[PDB]
Design a protein around this nucleic acid. Structure first.
Ligand SMILES: [K+]
Ligand SMILES: [K+]
Ligand SMILES: [K+]
Ligand SMILES: [K+]
Ligand SMILES: [K+]
Ligand SMILES: [K+]
Ligand SMILES: [K+]
Ligand SMILES: [K+]
Ligand SMILES: [K+]
Ligand SMILES: [K+]
Ligand SMILES: [Mg+2]
Ligand SMILES: [Mg+2]
Ligand SMILES: [Mg+2]
Ligand SMILES: [Mg+2]
Ligand SMILES: [Mg+2]
Ligand SMILES: [Mg+2]
Ligand SMILES: [Mg+2]
Ligand SMILES: [Mg+2]
Ligand SMILES: [Mg+2]
Ligand SMILES: [Mg+2]
Ligand SMILES: [Mg+2]
Ligand SMILES: [Mg+2]
Ligand SMILES: [Mg+2]
Ligand SMILES: [Mg+2]
Ligand SMILES: [Mg+2]
Ligand SMILES: [Mg+2]
Lengths: 145, 230, 186, 259
RNA sequence: GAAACUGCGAAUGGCUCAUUAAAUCAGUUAUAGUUUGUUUGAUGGUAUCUACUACUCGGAUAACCGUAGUAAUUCUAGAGCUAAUACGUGCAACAAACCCCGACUUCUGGAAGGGAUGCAUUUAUUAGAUAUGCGAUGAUUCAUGAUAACUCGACGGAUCGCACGGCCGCCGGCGACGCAUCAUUCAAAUUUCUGCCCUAUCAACUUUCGAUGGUAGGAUAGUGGCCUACCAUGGUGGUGACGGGUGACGGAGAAUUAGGGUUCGAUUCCGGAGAGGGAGCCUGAGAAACGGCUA
């Protein structure tokens, strides 16, 4: 179903051709799909626990841990494959004039297939290890808006 | 050119100079390792076989084995190898130097030769006498091999055989003998015994600690089980 | 030499970066091993950062391959390279890289199967009883059985020959085996 | 730089050492050891600057090379050996035993201790985990590793360690109602009892401490060292008992002492 | 005790500000994304198995000595010795337990014998729970255990100083140096968020030949278009991208002080960079080193 690449995609460490069955086994044991909770009060989406997609960069089913800064922003662009641009809007203080100016930051973030995002909705991104040239954040939550 | 003739059997060396091209024709086109009969090189060198060892050129550059040319080339050399001593230079430091090839040629200024086969007539400066070895064996095994000693013979007493006595410039009487190396003494056996004992004590301590921890865990588990039953 | 720094790259905006320092030894790269299948085994020793050791395989002949379903690992001979996902040219050159699909000799696994299940793909009473007990749960994938006939087993290289100097792997099974067989049947 | 720095400029030395600005261009760079460079007191400072046994660097080296100074019951000949919090410094020739403790102003003070009190020290546990072969062990914040620790002991607890036998003889769980001393920050050297602990996921934990006089202050978890069970410390505290006095009352006391 | 071999150091310090405008750098983060000579605390059990030194293995070389070459250099070739904590080997004090095969057998069994078995590497299988045992985190198929194997493993002491003792030759103290693992300390590398002067007489820029992202690999100490193959068309921009200037290293700070501000910061502290300009590299724990080498 998800074998759209030239190589076979599978969750590492999840043995599939076992003589036994994963009846009472925990996730990732007995061939059952592996998933985990990232902590920090975030809830694992129901689409990642029962999904079939393979994504090594997924916070809940991949090999990437969330640590560092958790940031919020708006979905600026969703044209890349499993990556979005998150626009963060803030005010910069101009000390001499005691006033503020509008400023923004574009933050590339990996989005797992368990999330449905659209240009304009609020997202929460957690920091992870470098994933590409510019991506250091993982989408953790989406508010459809 | 000039020649440096060395006799390893007698430990004697002599410098020889030839200016006749006919005699030198034998050595030309030869290599550093090849052997040359001494019949051409003079008349007293009859029956003598010479083995080339190397030499320098008219600018002093040495010959390097393996460079199959008669000219001079530039090579990147490692420290300690022939043609690059590299005294006082850093570890891993290489230098590009000029060396001459292993092929003998008229450009050479001197040749190094070793007598491999002795001829009929001895040479007055080389084979008449032999220079004794100054230092005898220092390793215990070497001393045992030299005197054909067995495993029970005391190698200590045979060291005095080749100890050299001399008179100092003051007129003092002095003697010197080498310190034997790799000689089994009670101290070495004690050190080995101490090593084995330390191993034993480490093993015993580990076993005791593991047993004590297991006992503590068993006692705690018994207490917890007693608590659970109520 | 080969460098892993980002100085030579462009900014995410597309602008050019001006140099402000020379290359550093701590961001270096080295040439690929390009390991191949050959009876003349050749593994090179590399001294790497911190004084540690890496093993560069230039030519490998045998590998350590495991049968997942049976939980058996045996040292067998790598016959050839059949499929490579990254680059098709790497199959023509018989390059040994991680995740490459190779055919390995089935003789060790055939011998283990015969010794364990008493089946070909004197004996004491106790051994016969043991084999009979093992025979109840003897279930074999038909595809693996057909493979055993030709003496070769499809396998995937799970090690990195250019880093550890070994072409180890596992035998394909189930859905992965079907996927790679379908990709090879073309 | 291309590697480790071996020098320490005097202005860059930690302020609690109290080194003269014009004393020189360099300060003793602490060596590698159980304590961090910024949170230590090298033996050279103790012997020369504090105890004044040695008048110079050379005299410090001469004293130490005679094997006359012991740290935690072990002879140390390294002048820049990092001696830190709770360490015991003993000089048998002078019959002197000292414990390194922070004064109310946050500076290491050589607290004279009795012979009995010099046979043990307190340590703070960093973590407990399984070593090779499944052997459990814990490590303290002074570089020590102890195998087969009590299963009840856990991170941030305090263990009483007997220097003679190098064994844990008692431990204190980190909990509310325990007297602690602050080992870092602006409140370093103060002593009080924990009131409550604030825990934030993925962030440092805040500890609230009440002084014996009712003064309240807060600090991070890593800056809190438990000194005993309840309100009685297991070791003798320096002069002042970790009570920070305001500058006004300090001046009043000084003026009263003057007359 | 000179000399010499061996070991270690020379990657610190000192100097300068050329390059460099989200770059260095400041504050604030992360490594669950890595390396780390050394110090401090703990931890080291299977090698010969039929050769068969372990009461102790082998071959060299310096200094030295004596034949020298060259105008010449810590430029250099032969010859005769002799050491090791140099080099290369090798018994490695002796076990139990676990797992596999297993003759034989009073046979749902147990059994001789054999294989495997230290630590390390590599790949697989498996355990690692917690609405009558089982560790840690906010979070990890994490720490760690077990099995099958694998590697032509620089590992698992052929070293040195003091003393001088107890049993009946066997045991025995205090140290030095050295090998491996973990933790720690001394650090680095990369990294999160926010922040920089003038200029539009710079409005589009980046994408053949990486630009933005994905998949699989290679390389790296390790993450990452860092590089390769294939795929998609992405990425930045009047909230000023891109381009240009700077007599621009950044900061801690300096001058002047109603307040707000203005101007300066090459220079002793912190961070970065460089060694006439580039590039490449050996040694090493650590250098793209320059009082190191190569072009
Ligand atoms: K000796
Ligand atoms: K030296
Ligand atoms: K060095
Ligand atoms: K910073
Ligand atoms: K648990
Ligand atoms: K700045
Ligand atoms: K990498
Ligand atoms: K990629
Ligand atoms: K700069
Ligand atoms: K070194
Ligand atoms: Mg420096
Ligand atoms: Mg400039
Ligand atoms: Mg930035
Ligand atoms: Mg270390
Ligand atoms: Mg694990
Ligand atoms: Mg990759
Ligand atoms: Mg400046
Ligand atoms: Mg200037
Ligand atoms: Mg100056
Ligand atoms: Mg500076
Ligand atoms: Mg430099
Ligand atoms: Mg100049
Ligand atoms: Mg130059
Ligand atoms: Mg350079
Ligand atoms: Mg200079
Ligand atoms: Mg220098």
């Amino acid at each position: 179903a998800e074998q759209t690449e030239k190589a076979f995609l599978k969750q590492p460490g999840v043995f599939l051709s076992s003589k036994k069955t994963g009846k009472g086994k925990r996730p990732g044991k007995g061939g059952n799909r592996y998933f985990k909770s990232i902590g920090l009060g975030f809830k694992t989406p129901r689409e990642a626990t029962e999904g079939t997609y393979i994504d090594k960069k997924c916070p809940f089913t991949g090999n990437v841990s969330i640590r560092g800064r958790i940031l919020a922003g708006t979905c600026h662009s969703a044209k890349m494959n499993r990556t979005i641009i998150v626009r963060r809007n803030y005010l910069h203080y101009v000390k001499k004039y005691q006033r503020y100016e509008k400023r923004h930051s574009n933050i590339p973030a990996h989005i797992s297939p368990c999330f449905r995002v659209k240009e304009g909705d609020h997202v929460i991104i957690g920091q992870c290890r470098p994933l590409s040239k510019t991506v250091r954040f993982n989408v953790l939550k989406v508010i459809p808006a | 050119m000039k020649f440096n003739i060395a006799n390893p059997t007698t430990g004697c060396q002599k410098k020889l100079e030839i200016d006749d091209d006919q005699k030198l024709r034998a050595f030309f086109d030869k290599r550093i390792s090849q052997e040359v009969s001494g019949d051409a090189l003079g008349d007293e060198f009859k029956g003598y076989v010479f083995k080339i060892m190397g030499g320098c050129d008219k600018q002093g550059f040495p010959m390097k084995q393996g460079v199959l040319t008669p000219g001079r080339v530039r090579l990147l050399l490692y420290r300690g190898t022939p043609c690059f001593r590299g005294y006082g230079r850093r570890n891993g430091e290489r230098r590009r130097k000029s060396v001459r090839g292993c092929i003998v040629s008229p450009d050479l200024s001197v040749l190094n030769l070793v007598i491999v086969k002795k001829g009929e007539n001895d040479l007055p400066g080389l084979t008449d006498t032999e220079k004794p070895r100054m230092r005898g064996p220092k390793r215990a095994s070497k001393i045992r091999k030299l005197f054909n000693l067995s495993k029970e013979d005391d190698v200590r007493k045979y060291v005095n055989t080749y100890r050299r006595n001399f008179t100092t410039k003051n007129g003092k009487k002095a003697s010197k003998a080498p310190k034997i190396q790799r000689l089994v003494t009670p101290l070495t056996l004690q050190r080995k015994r101490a090593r084995i004992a330390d191993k034993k004590k480490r093993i015993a301590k580990a076993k005791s600690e593991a047993a004590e921890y297991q006992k503590l865990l068993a006692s705690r588990l018994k207490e917890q089980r007693e608590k659970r039953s109520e | 030499g080969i460098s892993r720094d980002s100085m030579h790259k462009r900014r995410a905006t597309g602008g050019k970066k001006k140099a402000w320092r020379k290359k550093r030894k701590y961001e270096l790269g080295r040439q690929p091993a390009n390991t191949k299948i050959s009876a003349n085994k050749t593994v090179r020793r590399i001294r790497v950062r911190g004084g540690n050791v890496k093993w560069r395989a230039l030519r490998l002949d045998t590998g350590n391959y495991s049968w997942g379903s049976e939980a058996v690992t045996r040292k067998t001979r790598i016959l050839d390279v059949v499929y490579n996902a990254s680059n098709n040219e790497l199959v023509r050159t018989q390059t040994l890289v991680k995740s490459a699909i190779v055919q390995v000799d089935a003789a060790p696994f055939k011998q283990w199967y015969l010794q364990h299940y008493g089946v070909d793909i004197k004996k004491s009473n106790h051994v016969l009883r043991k084999i009979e007990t093992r025979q109840k749960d003897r279930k074999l994938d038909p595809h693996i059985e057909e493979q055993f006939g030709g003496g070769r087993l499809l396998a995937c290289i799970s090690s990195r020959p250019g880093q550890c100097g070994r072409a180890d792997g596992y035998i394909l099974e189930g859905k992965e085996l079907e996927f790679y067989m379908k990709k090879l049947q073309k | 730089a291309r590697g480790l720095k071996k020098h320490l400029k005097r202005l860059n030395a930690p302020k609690h050492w109290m080194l003269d600005k014009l004393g020189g261009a360099f300060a003793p760079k602490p060596s590698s050891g159980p304590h961090k460079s910024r949170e230590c007191l090298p033996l050279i400072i103790i012997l020369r600057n504090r105890l004044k046994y040695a008048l110079t660097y050379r005299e410090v080296i001469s004293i130490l090379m005679q094997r006359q100074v012991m740290v935690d019951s072990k002879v140390r000949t390294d002048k820049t050996y990092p001696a830190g919090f709770m360490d015991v410094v003993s000089i048998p020739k002078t019959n002197e035993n000292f414990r390194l403790l922070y004064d109310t102003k946050g500076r290491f003070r050589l607290h004279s201790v009795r012979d009995e009190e010099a046979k043990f020290k307190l340590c703070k546990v960093r973590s407990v985990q399984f070593g090779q072969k499944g052997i459990p062990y814990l490590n303290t914040y002074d570089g020590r590793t102890i195998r087969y620790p009590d299963p009840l002991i856990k991170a941030n607890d305090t263990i009483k360690l007997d220097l003679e036998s190098n064994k844990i003889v008692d431990f204190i769980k980190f909990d509310v109602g325990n007297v602690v001393m602050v080992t870092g920050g602006r409140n370093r050297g103060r002593v009080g009892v924990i009131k409550n602990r604030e825990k934030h996921k993925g962030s440092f934990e805040t500890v609230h401490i009440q002084d014996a006089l009712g003064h309240e202050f807060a600090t991070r978890l890593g800056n809190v060292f438990t000194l005993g069970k309840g309100t009685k410390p297991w070791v003798s505290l320096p002069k002042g008992k970790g009570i920070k006095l305001s500058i006004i009352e300090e001046a009043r006391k000084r003026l009263a002492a003057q007359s």
